[PDB]
Design a binder for this molecule. Structure first.
Ligand SMILES: Nc1nc2c(ncn2[C@@H]2O[C@H](COP(=O)(O)OP(=O)(O)OP(=O)(O)O)[C@@H](O)[C@H]2O)c(=O)[nH]1
Ligand SMILES: Nc1nc2c(ncn2[C@@H]2O[C@H](COP(=O)(O)OP(=O)(O)OP(=O)(O)O)[C@@H](O)[C@H]2O)c(=O)[nH]1
Ligand SMILES: Nc1nc2c(ncn2[C@@H]2O[C@H](COP(=O)(O)OP(=O)(O)O)[C@@H](O)[C@H]2O)c(=O)[nH]1
Ligand SMILES: [Mg+2]
Ligand SMILES: [Mg+2]
Lengths: 26, 372, 427, 48, 440, 430
């Protein structure tokens, strides 16, 4: 709320394997 | 600004790989811009180009830019889908069996209304699809001549893509029965076409949901769709016509009005063609004979063509002389009444391509629908 | 048999070089894929001069393409005729050459010339008989006058026998686009007079003047000018590609128009240039084409040849014409004004003819002339340089890059020696 | 007497339909577009 | 790969940058929450969003700028404003107390605590990118924060980086009016550590921008939001060729060598040509041959000077929109013949042209119309010397009996910097005076 | 390339300009909004179809120009062109020429440069001003001068309103009218002349409309200014440009003060009862009445008249009629003019302005003549100066404002010379 310290952070916050993406069916 | 974005797809002829591009169109100045999505680099920049028209950009349509012919496959964004894909609907049309004598008038009326034809073919359905169109068509009234004519003979069937074509084609028909059409007697297609009520009428879908059932019944998927619907030969069918680019100009309707003069018939109808191997390999007559042969096939590549079956009716004027000489301006100089002086728009690309050798006329027409 | 490599240096030289393929691919029937798409067969008998066959009927241009800014790479890899090019001939440059002769030569061009000489040599030793080199570039900017001028000597170090040709643009007579261009022009012509065998001097206000006084084109878009350069650049090389009843290659233009080894500064031109409204209102024949050929306004230098004497003239004609009308019309204009031609060369003009013109014209030509009046071009920059040199105007960037004041004095002296011997042969 | 934050409107102009914040996508005198030089020395014809 | 980087020091640096980054997100597609505009989809290649933005994994374009200021107040207004999602919060750094119009606090006692953090922040911005081309220093000569802390950012960046070019944008203390009282002190002491530590410094007077809004525009009563939009238009047009395709692009690297003759004369002026209200744009025929004629005329300048009393050395003209290369060439031809405007006689060319294809866009809420063409003039003029001489006279009035000095020298500051800045500034004037005459 | 920037100065000007630019507009076709439902001489094209006019309406007062800025034709004139001040001049040359004027001299001269930098062949500047007010005489003198040095050559014509004979509006006018002579005499390629009282007559004895107002009158100076600038616009046979008029009407460098006389000034309720043949119209300009400056030309020598016709006027009659006027033993011509008449003809007919006093005739003839009768005029006003200057009256202001009593004497001295020159110009050559 009051702008002192880290109030940025307060206000801001208030299935694949290498074979099946390279060796797919041609 | 106000960009038109489309997903392009071109096949490189020696690299047997599919290249996925992103076609940009700029209306108001006619600019074109190819754009690659395989990598993060451009292909073409914002350059003016006049051979593109706004009506040619359709999903599934085939277009030629910079001698590089690509097919449109997807929509680039939701804006073009809202601007074009929201209203562009493909409807089903089927002319009456008794409306064959004015078949081109239905084509001319469809072309003048803005309904471009994408699948307009006279096709003979299979045995299952002959009764499939007769299964949904069921009523207490007598259906003796209404069901017998469709299953055996050929009729002019067409799929037209336009804006709200389901309601636009239904607006063109109006009344269904010929007696009700004669009672209304308005300026409509069903007033001047369609005989004996439901025995032969220009049938149209009542809704887009029921349009799929009607479109699949007449022209199904290419497993049992049927390659041919007319006679392979008639001992005089040595004349075959071709409209490679005149279909996109709206000349398909008027080319049938001007061929019916001097007592010539109509037999065949189709609306599909491909890029290379079905036209280049089978123009073997023109493989080395004709000079400027490259231009002779360039305009055939872009637009799909319709091929026409003609048998010789009167030996006074054959079709080979009715069309005229090779150059369309010479057709103007020889006699303006010939076919290619009337409709020859391009310098050497004609409206109709005939069979030059009379012996190959029966060979060429037997390929186009019986083989395909 | 005979071949020419193509070199593009600088932003100006790149798209004059790129527009060249808008003019010689349709004269050779090459569509923007590399395949052949054309009418006549005689296009494809001497395709080896500019194009190299790749695998599968795909003609790739023989061109070495270098610039030090990436922003000009996309302009030449454009949509129309960009993908015909070999993609690894594109010699990139990350840090831009900041319009300095010293940056193009000493530091920034040093790490790239090692790559350019390797990619020049690949399309130089890979054939049977190399004939010519073509380097289109600029003399105002620091990239064309810094890299091509560095490539004017590194190339000649191991190819001294073979004729090489350059297509240089010069700062315009009155209104120009660069403020440090006399520094670049003086330093560039130091090596262009000692290495180049044929170099055609092209202005920019003359290309405007030929677009209004002759073409009557109310607003020339800026790609229109490079097309008029590339039409002439497609004409000087027409006989080693297309047959003729009396043909002339680059060497035979070189031995005839260069009397002495330091006099190769030429003035080009293209004869049949008509307006749209004067296409119907003008006959196209050999005499009248020649009358527009020697017109001062039809020249690529805005300075008229009245103040000088033509040391040598060559005319290269194209089209099915007669020899006698070529012979008599160049004889008659030789004797009509004999005071504008030098007296110590009696057969002062050279004639060349081809059989096939460029497409769309039944009969054309191209002009290449050596005149004493090109001294006025060089007298401008020599007067402009000494205005900028006695005050040390923009010398901070040149001296800080690794170069002394002795190179500027040597360049000014060699311009003055160049001017002095032109004045010597004026009388 | 301008109160807060904008420009001065002349009194004979304050009660007309303002069209200047609508169509002024194009203000500049657009430079004319000619015929190209791809046509004037390079047309195309044929044998006929 | 052809990108640049900017740092904004001071309240004026960030408030101008508020007006700049509105225009940078309207030229490129990027929405206020750092995103592509949805729907309308520009694709992969199209690499114009690189010179001022950094692309992450998703479509989150993050600007290439760090906004450092010792006051929290104006930075926090940016951080709570309509662009809170655009700037990365670790780029929106802030100080603790302001320098409070004090050069000593901005350089020695308050400016030394952020100097390690701002150099680390620029270094990872520089490490993330590869094709660095220039630096854009946005600040003001008036205050002690924006002029004292940038003196560190002019010197530490010169030692660490060096050969890479680095451009400066500043607010000239106004000639007739002034904002504060200690402004002539803060103005000239930075020049000792700005002269040999910079490549070019675009100098801008806010009082002339008042005169532009009064006459060229129809808007009396200008707010600072309206003033900094003109500066945003200028900074967009200098860097327009670095991002956008043009017939004659000019890179930032050759921009120096065709503007600054000598390594000490690096103070160009600015001029934006089509500063026309929307109604008068509906009236006037606007064309190339008269729009750069309006650049040279004294009533469209951005700094109080006089082209009729000051001779130009080199002129850099940058065009936008529907420009064609003779239209400048006919315009240079008709203005070389003008006997009102004088150049220096040892520079016969005296011109650099810049041609760009895409016209400027206008931010909503402004007064400019969507004009299809624009000119930005950046000229070295001898008339900046008499703008320096009045500021040296303003300093001498206070320094005659040594007033407003105990605020400086008490905070770790000496009097030798006051002494040496006078003959340093005298070295500016004698270098700008010796080019006034030509040798016959 | 037949442009003609037209600086309108003084209430007379900004009240002669509304009527004059209304004709132009109603002629070429430009509506009171530019958008048109040749035009270059007066109007200038913009990006779209907004043909903005090309003038520099000026007035050190802020009232009349403010009406235009709020009047009917409002969006036509550009906010800038209509330059205006904040304090009047108060019929005192000194003010408009030595004081207040100095302030608005830059704004106007500068805007003039801009209207001129968009011209590719300005054929000449026209100044429309009064000769008895402040901006009328003071500012005009200034603009006239600076414009002479800078724009140079460019013909400078001054359509103006000279103090009338007996009728008048101001008492300090005589001084001004003569204190603005060393301006015209020198800087003024050719100065036409009008006279309120004279136009009241031509709009009462010819227009039938009695009680005429400034509008009813201004329309006639506008119809006249539309015949000198007719050829440069609409085409015709013998077409005379602003330069020609001069090289056929200025018989000597100094003597450049012609007298205008429109001819077919008739009411529709009468023009439909006459033949109005070239003959008739012609004989009118040479009748001592239609003259627009009370100076009966039967007391002078018609040096070089310039008959500029318009409409359906075939050259044959133009020659026959001219001959009849050249054999009338009632007109009288200088010996040094064997010829005498410059006949021009434009097919475009005169245009009728809604609510106009004139009629839609099919032929018209403005006859710019150079007589030795303009002398008589400068002589009447001359006396009205010596009568007041004697008792150094109304001189306390001028001298204070910022000038010297010396100038007053020089004005009358210079004026005196003009009258003498005019006398020797037309003396039977012996
Ligand atoms: N052009 C422009 N100048 C500004 C703006 N805001 C403040 N200034 C100038 O900045 C000067 C004062 O310095 P500031 O920028 O306000 O603050 P600072 O730079 O952080 O320095 P300090 O005042 O010590 O905190 C004044 O002389 C103003 O002229 C602005 O929005 N636009
Ligand atoms: N009859 C007649 N007289 C006119 C007309 N216009 C101007 N005048 C005369 O010219 C004189 C000039 O008046 P103004 O134009 O107002 O004077 P000014 O030039 O503005 O000078 P200041 O009033 O001192 O500012 C008037 O007093 C009239 O007598 C007109 O249209 N008809
Ligand atoms: N034909 C042609 N000439 C150009 C072009 N751009 C610039 N020029 C000429 O080249 C000069 C500028 O040199 P430039 O090539 O831009 O320098 P560089 O970028 O360092 O190579 C100018 O004087 C122009 O006359 C262009 O696009 N086409
Ligand atoms: Mg502060
Ligand atoms: Mg008044």
């Amino acid at each position: 709320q009051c702008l002192l310290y880290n109030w940025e952070e307060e206000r801001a916050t208030n299935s694949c394997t290498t074979q099946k993406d390279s060796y797919q069916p041609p | 600004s106000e960009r038109f974005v489309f997903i392009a797809e071109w096949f490189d002829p020696n690299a047997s790989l599919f290249r996925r591009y992103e076609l940009l169109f700029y209306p108001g100045d006619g600019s074109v811009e190819m754009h690659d999505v395989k990598n993060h680099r451009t292909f073409l920049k914002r350059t003016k180009y006049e051979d593109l028209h706004l009506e040619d950009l359709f999903i599934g349509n085939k277009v030629n830019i910079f001698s590089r012919q690509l097919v449109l496959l997807d929509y680039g964004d939701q804006y073009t889908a809202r601007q074009l894909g929201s209203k562009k609907e493909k409807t089903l049309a089927l002319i009456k069996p008794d409306a064959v004598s004015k078949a081109g008038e239905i084509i001319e009326i469809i072309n003048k209304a803005g309904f471009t034809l994408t699948k307009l073919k006279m096709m003979t359905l299979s045995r299952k699809e002959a009764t499939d169109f007769h299964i949904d068509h069921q009523s207490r009234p007598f259906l003796n001549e209404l069901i017998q004519f469709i299953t055996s003979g050929p009729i002019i069937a067409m799929e037209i893509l336009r804006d709200d074509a389901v309601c636009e084609w239904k607006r063109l028909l109006g009344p269904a029965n010929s007696g009700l059409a004669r009672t209304d007697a308005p300026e409509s297609i069903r007033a001047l076409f369609g005989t004996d009520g439901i025995k032969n009428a220009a049938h149209g879908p009542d809704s887009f949901a029921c349009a799929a059932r009607e479109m699949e019944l007449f022209f199904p998927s290419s497993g049992v769709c049927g390659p041919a619907n007319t006679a392979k030969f008639t001992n005089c069918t040595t004349c075959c016509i071709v409209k490679p680019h005149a279909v996109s100009e709206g000349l398909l309707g008027k080319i049938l009005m001007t061929i019916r003069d001097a007592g010539f018939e109509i037999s065949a109808m189709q609306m599909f063609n491909m890029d290379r191997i079905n036209v280049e390999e089978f123009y073997e007559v023109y493989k080395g004979v004709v000079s400027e042969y490259n231009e002779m096939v360039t305009e055939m590549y872009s637009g799909p063509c319709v091929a026409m079956e003609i048998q010789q009716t009167n030996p006074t004027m054959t079709f080979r002389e009715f069309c005229g000489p090779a150059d369309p301006e010479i057709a103007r100089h020889l006699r303006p009444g010939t076919l290619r002086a009337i409709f020859g728009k391009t310098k050497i690309q004609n409206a109709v391509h005939c069979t030059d050798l009379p012996e190959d006329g029966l060979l060429e027409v037997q390929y186009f629908f019986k083989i395909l | 048999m005979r071949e020419i490599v193509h070199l593009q240096a600088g932003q100006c030289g790149n798209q004059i070089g790129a527009k060249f393929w808008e003019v010689i691919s349709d004269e050779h029937g090459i569509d923007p894929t590399g395949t052949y798409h054309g009418d006549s067969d005689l296009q494809l008998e001497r395709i080896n001069v500019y194009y190299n066959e790749a695998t599968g009927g795909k003609y790739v241009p023989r061109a070495v393409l270098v610039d030090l800014e990436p922003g000009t790479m996309d302009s030449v890899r454009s949509g129309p005729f960009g993908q015909i090019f070999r993609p690894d001939n594109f010699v990139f440059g990350q840090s831009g050459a900041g319009n300095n002769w010293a940056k193009g030569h000493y530091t920034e061009g040093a790490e790239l010339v090692d790559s350019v000489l390797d990619v020049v040599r690949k399309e130089a030793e890979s054939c049977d008989c190399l004939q010519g080199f073509q380097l289109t570039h600029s003399l105002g900017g620091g990239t064309g006058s810094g890299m091509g001028t560095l490539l004017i000597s590194k190339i000649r170090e191991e190819y001294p026998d073979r004729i090489m040709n350059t297509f240089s643009v010069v700062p315009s007579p009155k209104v120009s686009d660069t403020v440090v261009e006399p520094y670049n022009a003086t330093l560039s012509v130091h090596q262009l007079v000692e290495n180049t065998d044929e170099t055609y001097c092209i202005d920019n206000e003359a290309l405007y003047d030929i677009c209004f006084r002759t073409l009557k084109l109310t607003t020339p878009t800026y790609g229109d000018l490079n097309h008029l350069v590339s039409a002439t650049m497609s004409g000087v090389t027409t006989c080693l590609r297309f047959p003729g009843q009396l043909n002339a290659d680059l060497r035979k233009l070189a031995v005839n128009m260069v009397p002495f080894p330091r006099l190769h500064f030429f003035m080009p031109g293209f004869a049949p240039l008509t307006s749209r409204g004067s296409q119907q209102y003008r006959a196209l024949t050999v005499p009248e084409l020649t009358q527009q050929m020697f017109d001062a306004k039809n020249m690529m230098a805005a300075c008229d040849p009245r103040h000088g004497r033509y040391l040598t003239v060559a005319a290269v004609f194209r089209g099915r014409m007669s020899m006698k009308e070529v012979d008599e019309q160049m004889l008659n204009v030789q004797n009509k004004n004999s005071s504008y031609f030098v007296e110590w060369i009696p057969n002062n003009v050279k004639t060349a003819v081809c059989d096939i013109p460029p497409r769309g014209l039944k009969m054309s030509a191209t002009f290449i002339g050596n005149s004493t009046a090109i001294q006025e071009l060089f007298k401008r920059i020599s007067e402009q340089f000494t205005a900028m040199f006695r005050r040390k105007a923009f010398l901070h960037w040149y001296t800080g890059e690794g170069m002394d004041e002795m190179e500027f004095t040597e360049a000014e002296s060699n311009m003055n020696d160049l001017v002095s011997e032109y004045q010597q042969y004026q009388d | 007497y301008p109160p807060a934050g904008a420009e001065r409107v002349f009194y004979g102009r304050a009660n007309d339909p303002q069209i200047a914040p609508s169509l002024t996508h194009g203000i500049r005198s657009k430079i004319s577009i000619p015929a190209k030089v791809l046509i004037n020395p390079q047309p195309i014809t044929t044998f006929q | 790969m052809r990108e640049c980087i900017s740092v904004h020091v001071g309240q004026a640096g960030v408030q101008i940058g508020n007006a700049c980054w509105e225009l940078y997100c309207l030229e490129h597609g990027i929405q206020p929450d750092g995103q592509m505009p949805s729907d309308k989809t520009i694709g992969g290649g199209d690499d114009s969003f690189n010179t001022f933005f950094s692309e992450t994994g998703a479509g989150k374009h993050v600007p290439r700028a760090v906004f450092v200021d010792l006051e929290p107040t104006v930075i926090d207004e940016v951080r709570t404003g309509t662009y809170r999602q655009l700037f990365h919060p670790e780029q929106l750094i802030t100080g603790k107390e302001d320098a409070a119009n004090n050069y000593a606090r901005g350089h020695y006692t308050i400016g030394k605590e952020l100097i390690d953090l701002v150099l680390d922040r620029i270094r990872k911005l520089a490490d993330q990118c590869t094709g660095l081309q220039g630096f854009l220093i946005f600040h003001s000569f008036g205050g002690g924060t924006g002029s004292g802390f940038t003196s560190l950012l002019m010197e530490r960046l010169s030692v660490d980086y060096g050969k890479k070019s680095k451009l400066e944008f500043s607010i000239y203390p106004a000639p007739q009016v002034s904002t504060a009282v200690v402004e002539p002190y803060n103005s000239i002491l930075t020049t000792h550590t700005t002269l040999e530590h910079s490549d070019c410094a675009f100098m801008v007077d806010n009082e002339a921008i008042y005169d532009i809004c009064r006459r060229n525009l129809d808007i009396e009563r200008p707010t600072y939001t309206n003033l900094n939009r003109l500066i945003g238009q200028i900074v967009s047009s200098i860097t327009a060729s670095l991002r956008f395709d043009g017939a004659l692009n000019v890179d930032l690297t050759e921009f120096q060598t065709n503007l600054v003759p000598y390594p000490r004369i690096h103070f160009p002026l600015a001029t934006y040509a089509p500063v026309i209200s929307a109604e008068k744009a509906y009236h006037e025929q606007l064309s190339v041959a008269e729009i750069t004629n309006a650049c040279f005329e004294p009533a469209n300048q951005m700094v109080k000077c006089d082209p009729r009393h000051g001779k130009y050395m080199a002129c850099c003209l940058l065009y936008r929109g529907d420009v064609v290369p003779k239209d400048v060439n006919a315009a240079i031809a008709t203005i070389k013949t003008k006997r009102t405007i004088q150049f220096v006689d040892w520079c016969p060319t005296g011109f650099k042209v810049g041609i760009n294809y895409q016209p400027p866009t206008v931010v909503p809420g402004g007064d400019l119309a969507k004009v299809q063409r624009a000119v930005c003039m950046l000229s070295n003029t001898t008339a900046i010397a008499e703008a320096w001489a009045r500021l040296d006279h303003k300093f001498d009035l206070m320094y005659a009996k040594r007033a407003f000095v105990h605020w400086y020298v008490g905070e770790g500051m000496e009097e030798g910097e006051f002494s040496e800045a006078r003959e340093d500034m005298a070295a500016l004037e004698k270098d700008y005076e010796e080019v006034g005459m030509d040798s016959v």
